Amino acid sequence: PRSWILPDEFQLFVAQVQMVKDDDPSWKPTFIVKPDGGCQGDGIYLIKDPSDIRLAGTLQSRPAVVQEYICKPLLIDKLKFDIRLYVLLKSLDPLEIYIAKDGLSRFCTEPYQEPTPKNLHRIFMHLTNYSLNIHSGNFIHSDSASTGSKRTFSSILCRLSSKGVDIKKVWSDIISVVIKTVIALTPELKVFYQSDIPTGRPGPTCFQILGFD
Amino acid sequence: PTGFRTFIRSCKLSSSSLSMAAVDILYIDITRRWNSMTLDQRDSGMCLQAFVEAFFFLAQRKFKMLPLHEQVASLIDLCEYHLSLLDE
Amino acid sequence: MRECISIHVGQAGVQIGNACWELYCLEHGIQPDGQMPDSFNTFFSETGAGKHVPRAVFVDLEPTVIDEVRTGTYRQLFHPEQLITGKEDAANNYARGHYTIGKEIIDLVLDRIRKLADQCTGLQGFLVFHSFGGGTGSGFTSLLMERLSVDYGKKSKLEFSIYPAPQVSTAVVEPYNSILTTHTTLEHSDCAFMVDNEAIYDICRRNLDIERPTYTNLNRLISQIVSSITASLRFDGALNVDLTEFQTNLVPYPRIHFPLATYAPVISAEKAYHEQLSVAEITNACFEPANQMVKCDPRHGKYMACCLLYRGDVVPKDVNAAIATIKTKRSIQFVDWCPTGFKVGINYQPPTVVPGGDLAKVQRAVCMLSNTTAIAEAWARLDHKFDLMYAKRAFVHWYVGEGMEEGEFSEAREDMAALEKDYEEVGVDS
Amino acid sequence: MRECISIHVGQAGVQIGNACWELYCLEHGIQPDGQMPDSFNTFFSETGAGKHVPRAVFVDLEPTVIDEVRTGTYRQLFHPEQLITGKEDAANNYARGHYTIGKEIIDLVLDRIRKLADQCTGLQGFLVFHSFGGGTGSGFTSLLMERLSVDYGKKSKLEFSIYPAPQVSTAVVEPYNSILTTHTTLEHSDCAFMVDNEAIYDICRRNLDIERPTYTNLNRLISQIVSSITASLRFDGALNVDLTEFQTNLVPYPRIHFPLATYAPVISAEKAYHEQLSVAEITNACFEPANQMVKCDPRHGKYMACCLLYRGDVVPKDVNAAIATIKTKRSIQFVDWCPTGFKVGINYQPPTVVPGGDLAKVQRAVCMLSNTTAIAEAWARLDHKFDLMYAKRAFVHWYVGEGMEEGEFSEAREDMAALEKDYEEVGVDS
Amino acid sequence: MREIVHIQAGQCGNQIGAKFWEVISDEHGIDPTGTYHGDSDLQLDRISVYYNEATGGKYVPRAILVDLEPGTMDSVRSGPFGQIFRPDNFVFGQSGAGNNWAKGHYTEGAELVDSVLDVVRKEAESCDCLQGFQLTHSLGGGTGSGMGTLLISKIREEYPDRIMNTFSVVPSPKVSDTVVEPYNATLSVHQLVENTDETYCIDNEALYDICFRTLKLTTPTYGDLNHLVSATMSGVTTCLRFPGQLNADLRKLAVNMVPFPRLHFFMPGFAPLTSRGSQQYRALTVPELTQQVFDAKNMMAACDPRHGRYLTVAAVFRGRMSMKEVDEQMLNVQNKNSSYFVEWIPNNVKTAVCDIPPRGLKMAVTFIGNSTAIQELFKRISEQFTAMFRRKAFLHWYTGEGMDEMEFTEAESNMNDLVSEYQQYQ
Ligand SMILES: CC(=O)O[C@H]1C(=O)[C@@]2(C)[C@H]([C@H](OC(=O)c3ccccc3)[C@]3(O)C[C@H](OC(=O)[C@H](O)[C@@H](NC(=O)c4ccccc4)c4ccccc4)C(C)=C1C3(C)C)[C@]1(OC(C)=O)CO[C@@H]1C[C@@H]2O
Ligand SMILES: Nc1nc2c(ncn2[C@@H]2O[C@H](COP(=O)(O)CP(=O)(O)OP(=O)(O)O)[C@@H](O)[C@H]2O)c(=O)[nH]1
Ligand SMILES: Nc1nc2c(ncn2[C@@H]2O[C@H](COP(=O)(O)CP(=O)(O)OP(=O)(O)O)[C@@H](O)[C@H]2O)c(=O)[nH]1
Ligand SMILES: Nc1nc2c(ncn2[C@@H]2O[C@H](COP(=O)(O)CP(=O)(O)OP(=O)(O)O)[C@@H](O)[C@H]2O)c(=O)[nH]1
Ligand SMILES: [Mg+2]
Ligand SMILES: [Mg+2]
Ligand SMILES: [Mg+2]
């Protein structure tokens, strides 16, 4: 989804929102603000207008990202869930990418509803972070791979196929977006590899395990 | 800046329309913009994204009235041809 | 209830303001410390202790020109916070004073200007003193003007500026800055008053008979003209020209607001005992090609509006006689659409003489303001210099480094060309 | 018959009290020996032989700060029983000031307070000066206020506190004490004015030009504010405001009693001879979001209520004109449910300038007690720091080891969050 | 009021304490004979913090001096300011316990610890309000490292509510004059971690570095090294004995230095140490003191702070400066070197100000720094210890002096746990 970098691109974000609103008065977007250095969902909040950005304080010097919020995800048991997939990058030259057949599906602890001004503050129904949902009273710890707030991605895929959904196409497009992210992100890694491990000098080989959300 | 000028002189992108002064002005403007963009204001030199912007501008200058995918790619092909001539 | 605020910006503005305020203090009897040993209300604000503080703010993006004011003779006169100074000089760069260094000092100047305006009930306009061909005087002046319209909209913005000479220059980057200041002096000003140093040098050499003059005499002449402009707001006389009547009688069309200033009874002490400086003589001396303070031939163009500000022992009948005889010679030709092109003001106060000056004591003086189409000749040479410099991109990297694009260069050149076209076309007859 | 009793706790409290009582002695005309060479029957009591004993108790947990007063300039001023000191300090520990050492010295302070309050006929209320993250100044103040409310209910208790600064801090355990002490401030004090050291440093640098200030200048500024508050009780004049009157007018709801203090004519005695301090000038300077004594900006808040206290040559006509002028401005905005958002007060006594100070002998001065919703920013900042430690459970073992349970921290956090939401909800529009 | 009882142990402890007592007596204005000859009314207000008033304007320190060799007692007694001490505070043995920690902790120390504790109780009970004790010793010998552990273990249970400091000298790898010395250190750190409120690591090689580099001293001696330790000792407790804008007692320093109970090892420093021919070329300001106070060159411990990150910083300034300048300087450090600071402690620096400066000087600071880099010292000793323990070396002495094999393993486990827990918060 389209993104803006604060505080550098705040004016561009405001101008774009204003122009689209003028073009479409019925347009009621929802944006999500996430800190660059923030992890585990800390500092991430939801806004409906560019003016809703908290621009008064000492915490605004940190760069942030404003992103178009996906207001309509798939819901399983009326709970919006995200998928953590483990991807192996074997080498940059030649490029080698491997994708695990199973992942971890993390579910929200509250029923999902479309973003409204009355439920923006409800982080449990809008954030799928495990560290944030674990403190909720509705979090369920289950040893089964198909129940609880944390499940296996293969189980979710097979439940989806039980409704007649082509899981092969789903897996194909997951593979496509994963490979697309890796190729989009590779060139800076080749630059960093050259900077840190110059050609002609002894050095170890490198690989990585990445968690795609 | 020496790297940019060597690149320009190697892939022969310079011509009557684009002289050395214009190349230097473009380099200075791009470097200043990308240094100011980052949180740290030193950024002594040019990162990769600024080089991507410069390559986009150069590809826009050449091969006019062409799609963007055809652009950049055409300039890459020309630069590779000139490099192959250079090493050969 | 007729207060005016002056904004001396840049080195040239500061050292013209020194002479301006010396002359003002002498005229109104104010000592260099602020105590008199009404008329003084336009330029001075009175406090409880009887101390008169000047109604002006000094701004420069460097200390070296202001500390002389703060440690000189007139050090107890100005408010300590009205002398605003920066830390790093603009280094003859428009972008330096408009985008990078001048952006850190604009807030203090705006706050002090708002503080000054809070003390005025009959505020009339602003008297911006600056100079083209300089980093601060071209960039910070633009920033200040732009924002002084966003804030005070209907107020007047009178501009006194120094223009580059035909062949006598100081910096190799003068055409760039002077072209870039065209936007601000065009669509953020009401009357742009221009003077170049070469013409005042010639005037000093011929009239006052000074072989090697310097900036002080030039600034004193500028102060005399500025005092003549506002001499009606403070003193009393027969015909009084207000600030708004001046520009409603001098500016024909909105974009044509670039008058020309002249001061006739410019004479040394020795050569004044022999010449009877009657009203006709000085009135004719105003209409002399070798007497204008911008190097341009007034016979190579039209005459649109004329304002004659008389001070001293001037009876209106003699003014009518001088105007009548002026409209007889064919060497001074006007525009057919202005059958009446003469505005007259008469005030009683004679001009004053500062100690250690180069101007003789006289009992009548005339300041002449002319809206002539001979300024395009001045702009054309500078435009040619700019094109020659810009054909091979020269010094442009300095401007681009501080945050300016080449679109600014192109647009400024186009704007100047359009203004020149407008001036050339307004001279046609129909 | 208009008596107030002063209490000063901790090093900050005692030093502020020194400044304040020197100011009162200079004002009413009392030598440091308590004997003059009426208006004093609110901070002083007269014995048989002309002595004037102040109505204040100095309490501290460590000997040095009080011992400085015991052997100093004002040695023969306080009844030595009124000077109270312990044996060991709280060591920046709220638990020590509340549960371990404060309870060991709570009897003497109450006995002396009773002895002082039995010597008065009508008691307006107590005054308490302290800190907010200091240990003794938090814990012992909490204990003292908790017992004072029980023993002297339905009686005013106004407190002046030094809230922790957003950036500079003199301690590492500051947020813990600050968060734990905002329960008696919320539920045991009838009013509370908080000042920030950083704001006073900025004010001293910008206004008084004091490059390197010490704590004495800050304390003198607080002394000026406190004298401004309790001026309609001692001296007479125009419209007079007592403690109950401005408490009613400035506290809309019982949970909102956190105003901000401002003193407009802060002049370095060298800018005084260059500007006039009219009623409009000082009234505008009070509302300027730079001359504020805490690090909050009203521009990101709404002005819930306003109290103005004028001293010197002030007439109601100028006050009304200035209030109207403030009303017209749209940059500063009030909430909607107070059409009349001001309570004004005029006194005749000019402010007193102490020797070796930083102020100037002005003719009129104004003190602003402004209730806005911007304070929610400041607490928030402090709030953040607090949890940034409590997540790692840092430095908690000290507080736990001195009779304080683990639940008090979370209780105070929840209380402070509730107060923040309460202050935010009143800013909504109808 | 708020008096401290001083204890010296070993040769290193006795010499450092003698220099310290000369320093404090000069500061408070005390004759070597024991009289007061000084020009100030503030030198005698809190004199009841180190001294006791005997008959006829005589002042006698606390100064419990202990040793198992009766040579250091004679060295201290016949020596500058050596009759200033009470005659019966000298508790001396008959043999210096060799270089054996077992001897001074189990056999020779046992027959003298009771004798010491009698005089310790006798002095303490003559105090209005005992703030605490402080011990100066070295962790490389038998008498020092054994007595300063046995005595501290029995002083802590007797007065659990008081304050206990220790200016210990941690053994250095390069400057080594003892063979069995690592053993002693490994057997002491684990008792200096649960029995003392504070502990200052004073490595000798850092003192030599300061003398060679900062002071341009060709030939330093032990007196020059002890001068710095005495300066830091005085700067730690100045706010208990002279007035200030922001006082900082020992307990106030403790409460905002140790985030957790066992993180009480610090790095000392003294701000204005310059030279003798560079003085004229310097200006005595707050910013320059803060610059020579936070450098990995003015630190009295041999571990680079750049290798770790500070958890907390103290700064007991002494002089008539301004508070705004101090606060501004502290905000610059933290903003400039952000990486060298724990993120979960905002404003890690705790400040203080005392008016009276040390004689001659018009401004000084004492920097106390809790840093994770201190773990280096421990991980530098353990390795050596292991190098000598896998092949049992010099262990017959300790084994025959009553100890058993398991104590060494327990001590190594405790020290390893301390290193790991200090690394946890990095
Ligand atoms: C040329 C000159 O001006 O000499 C000064 C002096 O200022 C210098 C040389 C002194 C001098 O110190 C040293 O030479 C020195 C040598 C080795 C190790 C440590 C110090 C001085 O000895 C130290 C002495 O300082 C004091 O008097 C302090 O009060 C100090 N006094 C003692 O330690 C002391 C105690 C008992 C008997 C004699 C001295 C002190 C410091 C902290 C707390 C209490 C007291 C002074 C002014 C000097 C000399 C004499 C050269 C310095 O002293 C200190 C530690 O502040 C070393 O760097 C500082 C500043 C100067 O460079
Ligand atoms: N007639 C006068 N011309 C002046 C005076 N001072 C400067 N100048 C002219 O101005 C030009 C130089 O520009 P300035 O140095 O005054 C401009 P400023 O100081 O504002 O720019 P920076 O160099 O960026 O500081 C040059 O033509 C000078 O002859 C003056 O007092 N009178
Ligand atoms: N504006 C002032 N703030 C002060 C002053 N003295 C201290 N303080 C502030 O107080 C805070 C430090 O805590 P205090 O000095 O109040 C400690 P207190 O004596 O109350 O308790 P103990 O810890 O038992 O000594 C910190 O915010 C200082 O800036 C002063 O004179 N003026
Ligand atoms: N700074 C000082 N370090 C010292 C001094 N004396 C010794 N040392 C250092 O400490 C170590 C030896 O300390 P000591 O001889 O005082 C140990 P102690 O006498 O307590 O042990 P025993 O051998 O059991 O008697 C060794 O590293 C020495 O270089 C001294 O006076 N000052
Ligand atoms: Mg200049
Ligand atoms: Mg205290
Ligand atoms: Mg020994």
Author numbering:
A (entry chain E): 216 to 428
B (entry chain E): 570 to 657
C (entry chain C), D (entry chain A): 1 to 37, 47 to 439
E (entry chain B): 1 to 426
Give the exact sentences the study uses for this entry.
Among these, polyglutamylation—a dominant and conserved modification targeting unstructured tubulin C-terminal tails—plays a pivotal role in defining the tubulin code. Two principal glutamylation steps, branching and elongation, are catalyzed by several members of the TTL–like (TTLL) family, each with distinct substrate specificities. By combining cryo–electron microscopy (cryo-EM) and functional assays, this study uncovers an unanticipated type of tubulin glutamylation pattern, where TTLL11 extends the primary polypeptide chains of both α- and β-tubulin with specificity driven by the amino acid composition of the respective C-terminal residue.
To provide the structural basis for TTLL11 substrate recognition and interpret potential preferences for polymerized MTs and α- versus β-tubulin chains, we determined the cryo-EM structure of hTTLL11 (residues 128 to 657) in the complex with double-stabilized MTs (dsMTs) isolated from HEK293T cells. First, TTLL11 recognizes MTs in a unique bipartite pattern, where the MT-BHB and the catalytic domain engage adjacent protofilaments (PFs). The structured part of the MT-BHB forms a five-helix bundle (comprising helices α9 through α13) that is in apposition to the catalytic domain with a shared interface of ~1500 Å2. The cryo-EM structure revealed that the primary MT interaction motif of MT-BHB involves two amphipathic helices encompassing amino acids T571 to C580 (helix α10) and M589 to R601 (helix α11). However, the key interaction motif involves the hydrophobic face of the α11 helix comprising A590, I594, and I597 that is engaged by residues of the H11′ helix of α-tubulin and the side chains of F260/P261 of the β subunit. Residues A590, I594, I597, and R601 (helix α11) and R574/R578 (helix α10) of TTLL11 contribute prominently to the mixed ionic/hydrophobic interface with MTs. Although the density representing the TTLL11 catalytic core (residues P128 to P486) is less resolved, it was still possible to reliably dock the AlphaFold TTLL11 model into the cryo-EM map. The following segment (K488 to V535) connecting the catalytic domain to the MT-BHB is not visible in the map and therefore not included in the model, nor are the intrinsically disordered N and C termini, which are also missing from the cryo-EM map. Together, the cryo-EM data indicate that while the MT-BHB is rigidly docked onto the MT surface, the TTLL11 catalytic core (together with intrinsically disordered regions) and tubulin C-terminal tails are inherently flexible and can adopt a wide range of conformations.
